[PDB]
Design a protein around this ligand. Structure first.
Ligand code: NA
Ligand code: NA
Ligand code: NA
Lengths: 333, 345
């Protein structure tokens, strides 16, 4: 096996800012995870393992421009989806199997839209979902709440089902599963805009295609240690195309740059076009800029990817152990 | 011995603010610790144990009003002082007889005194101290630089007295404990660094004793809160210089009685700090922008130090993650601790 690969400097063209309250939001998010989601963990050990991933600072890194309340709401949302994704591992815990998922999660979310706790199916996470719905729905248009309903249903269905021929079919499945519709809706929420109409008309089809593909590729690169040990572009290149790891990494880093520059081109085309003068469109596009820059800053930071025990030292390029329990970028092999 | 104690709600009357770049300053401060101090630790794994304590967020929690560069300088200083404190506090690293202790300690003293010298340092502590001195002394008046020299000397005198208290197996009476800890806690450092962060020079006012009451009560508040939040980690260790040990072993109090007494004392000194501060603010210097900036700086030092001490795994155990709770039952025996609303049955 390789045991060690080199991650070169990535373009990092887009703003990566921290919310002015990022450190405090991470702690208050951690507090909310204990209060609302403790029962999803089989012990204090498992909860703290999760809290050590610092998932609570993702929100403030993606929406550094947002009002503190909305930044807290998004930080708690992302911890919530990560807990349910990673730690709610039983059809009993989630409230449905793959068979029952559709009509079950339709009724859970129907109940949440009404201000309830999503009923017996949602027993270990419905108080959590209710608290987030209360906070977030209040600052959303009714169209946005329709979209949140569909987004949360798909997410829980996606979870129930979880219990390639080529690279592009990998990209298609990574895009369908990354939660892009959530990210897009929450970007609108943070920026206090409603892009519901412009988005159905396809104004953002190109910026979303490149934006989300950049997010996914950066994520596949920085999550490769975690995934190697457990559906990802790195695995497709190595196994389906038979590339050496370093060649796969080099290919994916160049692909990050392709989609990053193409995102900027496509964003600039909307800014130059007949909706580009609109302030809400500008605010949304700045939102996506900070989501893309901030997600990558977050992905360097998290012990979810560098191993429980790791503490980021700010290094972003160099040699990294594929296998070691705890990793960091070293300036030599 | 008791297995737990109850920490009642403390007054928490003073502002605990985070620097707007706090998260980022912590990471960069972790980077400085690896670049300058990696070789102070026995391994990568002991370096990570130290980095997991989040000592890098102390700076941004105590000078949230400062410019980012000065906040970074203070963040790095506090991490460095925490390393020095853990080395001199460690009988194995230092020596557990006078002779061996004194030789090791003399090397630490000589290394840190290289900080403000003209020739390059050879030691790990010397190069770290030189780096921090060059960054900080650049933002200081000549009088503040002399005071920085005196602050290091005060800190080292205090460390020497804490070391001797272990060697001689002697718990000080409360007033001798507080008198040592004003040195060992680095109060002169914190005062000067608070002027530096606020970009003021209080050298003249301090010489005239404008802040004697403000300092007396504010520093006592800081030391007492630190003693309460550090007890979990200090309780099994021996002859350490903490008022919890003074009240238990010198004055014969049961742990919970000692804790309750020290919480009453935190509130005494915290209210006396606010009264003393308000007197300066109402007095013939109280309109001065620099005086007001300094006292606002001490408010944030006092509030932020307490916030930091609740969050750090240095106190709540490696692997702990603060949930924001500030009062309740705390285990002395658990490998990780947090405040609970019931005792262990
Ligand atoms: Na902050
Ligand atoms: Na996980
Ligand atoms: Na690192």
């Amino acid at each position: 096996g390789p045991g060690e690969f080199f991650l070169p400097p990535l373009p990092r063209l887009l703003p990566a800012g921290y919310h002015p309250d990022a450190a405090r939001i991470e702690i208050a998010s951690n507090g909310w995870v204990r209060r609302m989601l403790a029962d999803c963990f089989d012990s204090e050990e498992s909860l703290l393992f999760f809290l050590r991933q610092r998932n609570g600072i993702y929100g403030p890194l993606t929406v550094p421009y947002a009002e503190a309340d909305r930044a807290q709401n998004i930080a708690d949302w992302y911890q919530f989806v990560t807990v349910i994704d990673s730690f709610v591992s039983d059809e009993a815990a989630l409230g449905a199997d793959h068979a029952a998922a559709a009509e079950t999660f339709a009724a859970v979310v129907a109940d949440l839209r009404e201000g309830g706790a999503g009923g017996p199916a949602a027993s270990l996470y419905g108080r959590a979902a209710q608290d987030l719905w209360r906070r977030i729905a209040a600052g959303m248009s009714a169209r946005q709440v329709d979209r949140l309903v569909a987004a949360l249903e798909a997410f829980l269905r996606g979870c129930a089902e979880e219990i390639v021929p080529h690279f592009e079919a990998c990209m298609r499945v990574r895009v369908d599963s990354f939660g892009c519709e959530f990210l897009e809706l929450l970007t609108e929420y943070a920026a206090e805009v409603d892009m519901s109409r412009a988005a159905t008309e396809g104004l953002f089809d190109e910026v979303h295609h490149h934006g989300m593909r950049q997010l996914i590729l950066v994520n596949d690169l920085l999550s490769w240690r975690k995934e190697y040990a457990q559906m990802t572009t790195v695995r497709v290149l190595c196994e389906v195309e038979g590339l050496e790891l370093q060649d796969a990494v080099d290919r994916l880093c160049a692909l990050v740059e392709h989609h990053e520059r193409a995102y900027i081109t496509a964003r600039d085309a909307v800014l130059a076009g007949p909706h580009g003068h609109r302030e809400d469109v500008r605010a949304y596009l700045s939102g996506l800029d900070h989501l893309i820059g901030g997600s990558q800053e977050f992905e360097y930071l998290t012990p979810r990817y560098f191993g429980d025990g790791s503490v980021w030292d700010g290094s972003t390029s160099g040699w990294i152990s594929l296998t070691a329990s705890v990793a960091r970028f070293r300036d030599a092999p």
